[PDB]
Amino acid sequence: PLGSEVYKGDGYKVWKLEPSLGDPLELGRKTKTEMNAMTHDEFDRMKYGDKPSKGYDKLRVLLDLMDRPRLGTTVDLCAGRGGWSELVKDLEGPKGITAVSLWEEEWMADPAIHRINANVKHLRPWQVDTLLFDGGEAFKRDQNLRKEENFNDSLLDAVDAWMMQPVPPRNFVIKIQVPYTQKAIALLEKWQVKTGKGRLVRLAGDRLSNTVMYFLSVRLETQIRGRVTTFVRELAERRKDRSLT
Ligand SMILES: Nc1ncnc2c1ncn2[C@@H]1O[C@H](C[C@@H](N)CC[C@H](N)C(=O)O)[C@@H](O)[C@H]1O
């Protein structure tokens, strides 16, 4: 019998993403343009307190997908209100966490968690057991597409320094807000070479109004370009399905 292996246990939690043919940047820009043109009706129909934020439960699902590793010294980059840091603190205590964010957003997590008020694009890395990053922003419709792409590429370039240091993080959870840019795909491929690990996932039930994926330190899953292509094609189809009659 399959036994306990049944519970971990991928089927329910993330999209199946086998690689397919196509240009992910062209397809991503196409579906973003279509979404920008949607009516209130269309857009609304598919755009759809215990914790410091809704991020706590999200990180719990991701860490379970990773077989619940021991976290050790952890940096939480772009910590915001602290949902991810609070999860780490509940798991292992406050001592091993450093939270980095621009609080200029107020901290809703344990005040015992060490915090650094800094731009993650300026802060230089240090050696950690676990690297967490939940930065990234979806832009509103009125703006040009390349602006959103460049903003999120810049954040990813900040994470790159943490990943490429001489002793990289053993565990990592990296939010990829815009995964179909040339830079995002090149960065993910590079981190797979550096670490020998890493799989890009789309979480089931994430909002269709965004293009968010998560890069997780589970076993290597390669062909990232084709899997992003599959993701953006399927996303455009599910946006169409939801926005319609
Ligand atoms: N360049 C930057 N440096 C530091 N923090 C940033 C930067 N850009 C955005 N942020 C912050 O990153 C946060 C992103 C949030 N999604 C984090 C949520 C957090 N994971 C939670 O569970 O509550 C926002 O609070 C932003 O204020």
Residue numbers in the entry: 38 to 85, 95 to 150, 154 to 294
Excerpt from the publication:
Alongshan virus (ALSV), a newly discovered member of unclassified Flaviviridae family, is able to infect humans. ALSV NSP1 is a typical flavivirus NS5-like protein. It carries two essential enzymatic activities: the methyltransferase (MTase) and the RNA-dependent RNA polymerase (RdRp). The flaviviral NS5-MTase functions to catalyze the methylation of viral RNA cap.
